[PDB]
């Protein structure tokens, strides 16, 4: 009678008026997300393993990185295999409503968690690079720990709504994965959506911009400052300080790329969702929603690869532990030089 009926979840009428996408599409979708499961869990596992165990990567701020990897690891695990991948190969989410809720809720909770964690990372960047060298402040375990606690509370807060009726996680697109209902336009649903977008998304974004734009509108504040202290009878020991700023700067740059990655990955889907809740629902087709959600889902598998091609200490560790990964990205000692000088302290003028 129908090719979309789910005896465990009521499919919104909107996704029911369409025809059922070809088998090949379901199979590809399954294989696709499954491979995000592998790369995602694999790569984030590696960052969690190496960062918690390498001596070099032992500073408080790195906790954010670990927190981000835990976030992306779980996203990739829960959102790929087996909940979605298996659903695809059968062309039906066979894991019932509760699974669906857990799935959608986990997806939202860690998507909110990866940007907010990046926000905390953008803050650390601002304290070490965004403020004047004289006031430069490094991350402390105390601060860091409190910050991630905020991250977790925050993330759960803006994602748990649909768990209590203030919105809802249900099926979308080809009905083989779960998400938050962006179709239904009632007061309740719409407020939760507005909350998700503004508190969950725009929020950490402001923190990010305010921190990076603050690091940019300080490159010169630092440019001058570097000189004033430079000619300040500061011996060749000035090089040390310089290397440190380079080293930190590089990390700050990294931060921005992963943030860019996040935004480029989610914004599309975000947009398609808003059209469905505020614009021509007739646009949000099976593929209009599906394809942009896959692009979003894979977001949680990028940071680890970004780190492996631009994070020196991390790249060092990999060469020393799972060095096979660094094949096409060969390691070398020169990549760690700026970190060497930045810490090779000088004994009383030396
Ligand atoms: C298949 C994965 C799903 C359905 C993910 C659910 C994710 C959320 C509810 C994410 C919320 C958002 C962000 C983390 C940033 C971009 C904009 C939002 C509000 C859609
Ligand atoms: C890419 C995400 C950026 C996270 C920034 C990681 C912050 C680590 O920055 C680290 O600070 C240490 C000071 O205790 C320095 O010794 C390290 O060289 C520097 O890489
Ligand atoms: C469905 C639940 C998913 C959560 C599972 C997360 C597992 C990620 C790996 C954690 C590694 C932490 C290692 C700590 C080091 C010590 O030893």
Coordinates of C-alpha atoms and ligand atoms in Angstrom, one line a residue:
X1 CA 0.0 0.0 0.0
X2 CA 2.9 2.3 0.8
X3 CA 6.7 2.1 0.5
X4 CA 7.4 4.4 3.4
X5 CA 5.3 3.1 6.3
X6 CA 7.0 2.6 9.6
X7 CA 5.1 0.7 12.3
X8 CA 7.3 2.4 15.0
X9 CA 7.4 6.0 13.8
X10 CA 4.7 8.2 12.2
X11 CA 6.3 9.6 9.0
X12 CA 5.4 13.3 8.5
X13 CA 2.9 13.4 5.4
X14 CA 5.5 15.6 3.6
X15 CA 8.0 12.8 3.2
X16 CA 5.2 10.5 2.2
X17 CA 3.9 12.2 -0.9
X18 CA 7.1 11.4 -2.7
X19 CA 8.0 8.2 -4.6
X20 CA 10.7 5.8 -3.2
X21 CA 14.2 6.7 -4.3
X22 CA 16.0 3.8 -6.3
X23 CA 17.8 0.9 -4.5
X24 CA 21.2 2.1 -5.6
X25 CA 20.6 5.4 -3.8
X26 CA 19.8 3.6 -0.5
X27 CA 22.8 1.3 -0.9
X28 CA 25.1 4.2 -1.6
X29 CA 23.7 6.2 1.3
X30 CA 24.4 3.2 3.6
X31 CA 27.9 2.6 2.3
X32 CA 28.5 6.4 2.6
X33 CA 27.6 6.9 6.2
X34 CA 29.1 3.6 7.1
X35 CA 32.5 4.9 5.8
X36 CA 32.0 8.0 7.9
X37 CA 31.6 5.6 10.8
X38 CA 34.9 4.0 10.1
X39 CA 37.0 7.1 9.3
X40 CA 35.2 9.1 12.0
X41 CA 35.6 6.5 14.9
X42 CA 39.0 5.6 13.6
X43 CA 40.4 9.1 13.2
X44 CA 38.8 10.5 16.4
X45 CA 39.9 7.5 18.3
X46 CA 43.5 8.2 17.2
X47 CA 43.4 11.9 18.4
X48 CA 41.8 10.8 21.7
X49 CA 44.4 8.1 22.2
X50 CA 47.5 10.1 21.2
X51 CA 46.5 13.3 22.9
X52 CA 45.6 11.7 26.3
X53 CA 48.8 9.6 26.1
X54 CA 51.5 11.7 24.4
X55 CA 53.6 13.8 26.7
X56 CA 54.0 16.6 24.3
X57 CA 50.3 17.2 23.8
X58 CA 49.8 17.4 27.6
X59 CA 48.6 21.1 28.1
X60 CA 45.1 22.0 29.4
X61 CA 43.8 23.6 26.2
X62 CA 44.3 20.2 24.4
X63 CA 41.5 18.9 26.6
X64 CA 39.2 20.8 24.3
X65 CA 40.6 18.9 21.3
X66 CA 40.0 15.6 23.1
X67 CA 36.5 16.8 24.0
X68 CA 35.9 17.6 20.3
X69 CA 37.2 14.1 19.2
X70 CA 35.0 12.4 21.8
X71 CA 32.1 14.5 20.3
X72 CA 32.9 13.6 16.7
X73 CA 33.7 10.0 17.6
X74 CA 30.2 9.5 19.1
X75 CA 28.5 11.3 16.3
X76 CA 30.1 9.1 13.7
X77 CA 29.4 5.9 15.8
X78 CA 25.8 6.6 16.5
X79 CA 24.9 8.3 13.2
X80 CA 26.6 5.8 10.8
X81 CA 26.8 2.0 11.5
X82 CA 24.5 0.3 12.4
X83 CA 21.5 2.5 12.9
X84 CA 21.6 4.3 9.5
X85 CA 23.7 2.0 7.4
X86 CA 21.4 -1.0 8.3
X87 CA 18.3 1.1 7.8
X88 CA 19.5 2.0 4.4
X89 CA 20.3 -1.6 3.2
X90 CA 16.7 -2.6 4.1
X91 CA 15.2 0.7 3.0
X92 CA 13.6 1.2 6.5
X93 CA 14.6 2.4 10.0
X94 CA 13.9 -0.9 11.8
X95 CA 15.2 0.3 15.2
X96 CA 11.9 1.9 16.4
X97 CA 11.0 5.2 17.8
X98 CA 13.1 5.2 21.0
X99 CA 16.2 4.5 18.8
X100 CA 15.2 7.3 16.5
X101 CA 14.9 9.7 19.4
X102 CA 18.3 8.6 20.8
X103 CA 19.7 8.9 17.3
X104 CA 18.4 12.4 16.6
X105 CA 19.2 13.6 20.1
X106 CA 22.8 12.3 20.0
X107 CA 23.2 13.9 16.5
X108 CA 22.1 17.3 17.8
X109 CA 23.8 17.0 21.2
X110 CA 27.3 16.4 19.6
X111 CA 26.8 18.8 16.7
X112 CA 26.1 21.5 19.2
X113 CA 29.1 20.2 21.2
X114 CA 31.6 20.3 18.5
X115 CA 31.1 24.1 17.7
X116 CA 30.8 25.1 21.3
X117 CA 34.0 23.2 22.1
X118 CA 35.6 25.0 19.1
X119 CA 34.2 28.2 20.8
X120 CA 36.2 27.3 24.0
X121 CA 39.2 26.7 21.7
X122 CA 38.7 30.1 20.1
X123 CA 38.7 31.6 23.6
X124 CA 42.0 30.0 24.5
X125 CA 43.4 31.2 21.2
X126 CA 42.3 34.8 22.1
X127 CA 44.0 34.6 25.5
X128 CA 47.4 33.4 24.1
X129 CA 47.3 35.2 20.8
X130 CA 44.5 37.8 21.0
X131 CA 45.8 39.7 24.0
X132 CA 49.1 41.6 24.2
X133 CA 52.1 39.4 24.9
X134 CA 52.4 41.2 28.3
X135 CA 48.9 40.0 29.2
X136 CA 49.1 36.6 27.4
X137 CA 47.3 33.9 29.4
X138 CA 47.7 30.1 29.0
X139 CA 44.8 27.7 29.7
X140 CA 44.6 26.1 33.1
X141 CA 43.1 22.7 34.0
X142 CA 40.7 24.5 36.4
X143 CA 39.4 26.8 33.7
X144 CA 39.4 24.2 30.9
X145 CA 37.5 21.7 33.0
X146 CA 34.8 24.2 33.9
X147 CA 34.6 25.3 30.3
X148 CA 33.9 21.7 29.0
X149 CA 31.3 21.3 31.8
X150 CA 29.6 24.4 30.3
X151 CA 30.0 22.8 26.9
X152 CA 28.3 19.6 28.0
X153 CA 25.4 21.4 29.9
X154 CA 24.9 23.7 27.0
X155 CA 24.9 21.0 24.3
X156 CA 22.5 18.8 26.2
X157 CA 20.3 21.8 27.0
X158 CA 19.6 22.9 23.4
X159 CA 19.3 19.3 22.1
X160 CA 17.1 17.8 24.8
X161 CA 14.0 19.8 24.0
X162 CA 12.4 17.4 21.5
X163 CA 13.0 14.7 24.2
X164 CA 10.4 16.4 26.3
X165 CA 7.9 17.6 23.7
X166 CA 9.5 21.0 23.0
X167 CA 10.1 19.8 19.4
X168 CA 10.8 16.3 18.2
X169 CA 13.3 14.0 16.6
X170 CA 11.7 12.0 13.8
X171 CA 12.5 10.7 10.3
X172 CA 13.5 12.8 7.3
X173 CA 14.4 12.5 3.6
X174 CA 14.3 8.8 2.6
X175 CA 13.4 7.9 6.1
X176 CA 16.5 5.9 7.1
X177 CA 17.9 8.2 9.7
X178 CA 16.5 10.5 12.3
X179 CA 16.6 14.3 12.9
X180 CA 14.6 17.1 14.5
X181 CA 11.2 17.9 12.9
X182 CA 11.6 21.1 10.9
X183 CA 8.5 20.6 8.9
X184 CA 5.7 21.0 11.5
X185 CA 5.1 24.8 12.0
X186 CA 3.3 25.0 15.4
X187 CA 4.3 27.4 18.2
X188 CA 6.2 24.7 20.2
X189 CA 8.2 23.2 17.3
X190 CA 9.1 26.6 15.9
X191 CA 10.4 28.0 19.2
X192 CA 12.6 24.9 19.7
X193 CA 13.9 25.3 16.2
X194 CA 14.5 29.1 16.7
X195 CA 16.2 28.1 20.0
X196 CA 18.4 25.5 18.3
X197 CA 19.5 27.8 15.5
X198 CA 20.1 30.9 17.7
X199 CA 21.4 29.4 21.0
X200 CA 22.9 26.2 19.6
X201 CA 24.4 27.5 16.4
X202 CA 24.6 31.3 16.1
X203 CA 25.7 31.5 19.7
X204 CA 29.1 29.7 19.6
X205 CA 29.5 31.5 16.3
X206 CA 29.5 34.9 17.9
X207 CA 32.1 33.7 20.4
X208 CA 34.2 32.3 17.5
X209 CA 34.1 35.6 15.4
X210 CA 34.5 37.8 18.5
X211 CA 37.6 35.8 19.3
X212 CA 39.1 35.5 15.9
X213 CA 38.2 38.9 14.8
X214 CA 39.8 40.0 18.0
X215 CA 43.0 38.0 17.1
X216 CA 43.0 39.8 13.8
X217 CA 42.5 43.3 15.3
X218 CA 45.5 42.6 17.4
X219 CA 47.9 41.2 14.9
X220 CA 49.2 44.8 14.6
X221 CA 48.8 45.5 18.3
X222 CA 51.3 42.6 18.5
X223 CA 53.3 43.7 15.5
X224 CA 54.3 46.9 17.2
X225 CA 54.6 45.4 20.7
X226 CA 57.0 42.7 19.3
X227 CA 59.4 45.5 18.2
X228 CA 59.2 47.6 21.5
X229 CA 60.4 44.6 23.5
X230 CA 62.7 43.5 20.7
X231 CA 65.0 46.5 20.8
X232 CA 64.4 46.3 24.6
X233 CA 68.0 45.0 25.1
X234 CA 66.3 41.6 24.5
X235 CA 69.2 39.4 23.3
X236 CA 69.0 36.7 20.6
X237 CA 66.7 35.2 23.3
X238 CA 64.1 37.2 21.5
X239 CA 63.9 34.4 18.8
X240 CA 62.5 32.1 21.5
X241 CA 59.5 34.4 22.1
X242 CA 59.0 34.7 18.3
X243 CA 58.9 30.9 17.7
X244 CA 56.3 30.6 20.5
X245 CA 54.0 33.1 18.7
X246 CA 54.5 31.3 15.4
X247 CA 53.7 28.0 17.1
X248 CA 50.5 29.4 18.8
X249 CA 49.6 31.2 15.6
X250 CA 49.7 27.9 13.6
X251 CA 47.4 26.3 16.1
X252 CA 45.0 29.3 15.9
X253 CA 45.0 28.9 12.1
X254 CA 44.1 25.2 12.5
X255 CA 41.2 26.1 14.8
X256 CA 39.8 28.3 12.1
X257 CA 40.0 25.6 9.4
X258 CA 38.1 23.1 11.5
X259 CA 35.6 25.8 12.3
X260 CA 35.4 26.6 8.6
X261 CA 34.9 22.9 8.0
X262 CA 32.0 22.7 10.5
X263 CA 30.2 25.7 9.0
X264 CA 30.7 24.7 5.4
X265 CA 29.4 21.2 6.4
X266 CA 26.3 22.2 8.4
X267 CA 25.1 25.5 6.9
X268 CA 23.7 23.8 3.8
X269 CA 21.4 21.4 5.7
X270 CA 20.6 24.2 8.2
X271 CA 19.4 26.2 5.3
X272 CA 17.2 23.4 3.8
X273 CA 15.7 23.0 7.2
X274 CA 14.8 26.7 7.5
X275 CA 13.1 26.6 4.1
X276 CA 11.0 23.7 5.3
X277 CA 10.0 25.6 8.4
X278 CA 9.7 29.1 6.8
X279 CA 9.7 28.8 3.1
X280 CA 8.6 26.7 0.1
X281 CA 8.2 23.2 1.7
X282 CA 7.9 22.2 -1.9
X283 CA 11.6 22.6 -2.2
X284 CA 12.6 20.3 0.6
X285 CA 12.5 17.1 -1.5
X286 CA 13.9 13.7 -0.6
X287 CA 17.3 14.6 -2.0
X288 CA 17.0 18.3 -1.0
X289 CA 17.1 17.1 2.5
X290 CA 19.1 13.8 2.3
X291 CA 22.2 14.9 0.3
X292 CA 22.8 18.0 2.4
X293 CA 22.4 16.0 5.7
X294 CA 25.0 13.4 4.6
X295 CA 27.4 16.3 3.9
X296 CA 26.6 17.5 7.4
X297 CA 27.1 14.1 9.0
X298 CA 30.5 13.6 7.6
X299 CA 31.6 16.8 9.3
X300 CA 32.5 14.8 12.3
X301 CA 35.2 12.9 10.4
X302 CA 37.3 15.8 9.3
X303 CA 39.2 17.3 12.1
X304 CA 41.5 14.3 12.6
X305 CA 42.5 14.4 8.9
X306 CA 43.0 18.2 9.2
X307 CA 45.2 17.7 12.2
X308 CA 47.3 15.0 10.5
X309 CA 48.4 17.4 7.7
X310 CA 49.0 20.6 9.8
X311 CA 49.5 19.7 13.5
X312 CA 53.3 19.2 14.1
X313 CA 53.3 17.7 17.6
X314 CA 50.4 15.5 16.6
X315 CA 52.0 14.5 13.4
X316 CA 55.2 13.7 15.4
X317 CA 53.2 11.4 17.7
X318 CA 51.6 9.6 14.7
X319 CA 55.0 8.9 13.0
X320 CA 56.0 7.4 16.3
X321 CA 52.8 5.2 16.9
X322 CA 50.6 4.5 13.7
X323 CA 53.1 6.0 11.2
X324 CA 51.5 4.2 8.3
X325 CA 48.9 7.0 8.2
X326 CA 51.6 9.6 7.5
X327 CA 52.6 7.8 4.3
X328 CA 51.4 10.4 1.8
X329 CA 52.0 13.0 4.5
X330 CA 55.6 12.1 5.5
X331 CA 56.8 13.5 8.8
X332 CA 60.2 15.4 9.5
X333 CA 62.0 16.9 12.5
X334 CA 61.9 20.4 11.1
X335 CA 58.1 20.5 11.7
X336 CA 58.8 20.7 15.5
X337 CA 61.6 23.2 15.5
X338 CA 59.4 26.3 16.5
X339 CA 58.2 24.3 19.5
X340 CA 61.7 23.5 20.5
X341 CA 62.9 27.1 20.7
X342 CA 59.6 28.3 22.2
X343 CA 60.4 26.1 25.2
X344 CA 64.3 25.8 25.2
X345 CA 64.5 28.3 28.0
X346 CA 67.5 30.5 28.4
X347 CA 69.5 30.4 31.8
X348 CA 70.0 34.0 33.0
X349 CA 70.5 35.7 29.6
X350 CA 72.0 32.2 28.8
Ligands
LIG1 C1 21.7 13.0 10.7 C2 22.1 14.1 11.6 C3 21.3 14.9 12.2 C4 19.8 14.9 11.9 C5 21.7 15.9 13.0 C6 21.1 16.7 13.9 C7 21.7 17.9 14.2 C8 21.2 19.1 14.9 C9 19.9 19.3 15.4 C10 22.1 20.2 14.6 C11 21.9 21.4 14.9 C12 22.7 22.5 14.3 C13 24.0 22.7 14.4 C14 24.9 21.9 15.3 C15 24.8 23.8 13.7 C16 24.1 24.2 12.4 C17 22.7 24.5 12.5 C18 21.8 23.5 13.3 C19 21.0 24.4 14.3 C20 20.9 22.8 12.4
LIG2 C1 43.8 23.3 17.1 C2 43.1 23.5 18.3 C3 44.0 24.5 19.0 C4 44.1 23.9 20.3 C5 45.2 24.7 20.9 C6 46.0 23.8 21.6 C7 46.7 24.6 22.6 C8 48.1 24.0 22.7 O1 49.0 25.0 22.5 C9 50.1 24.6 23.1 O2 50.3 25.4 24.4 C10 51.4 24.9 25.1 C11 51.6 25.8 26.5 O3 51.2 24.9 27.7 C12 52.5 25.1 24.2 O4 53.6 24.6 24.9 C13 52.4 24.2 22.8 O5 53.4 24.4 21.9 C14 51.2 24.7 22.1 O6 51.0 23.9 20.8
LIG3 C1 27.5 4.7 22.7 C2 28.6 5.2 23.7 C3 29.8 5.8 22.9 C4 30.9 6.3 23.8 C5 32.2 5.5 23.7 C6 33.4 6.4 23.7 C7 34.7 5.6 23.5 C8 35.8 6.5 23.0 C9 37.2 6.1 23.4 C10 37.6 6.7 24.8 C11 39.1 6.6 25.0 C12 39.5 7.1 26.3 C13 40.8 6.6 26.8 C14 41.3 7.1 28.1 C15 42.8 6.7 28.4 C16 42.9 5.9 29.7 O1 43.3 4.8 29.6

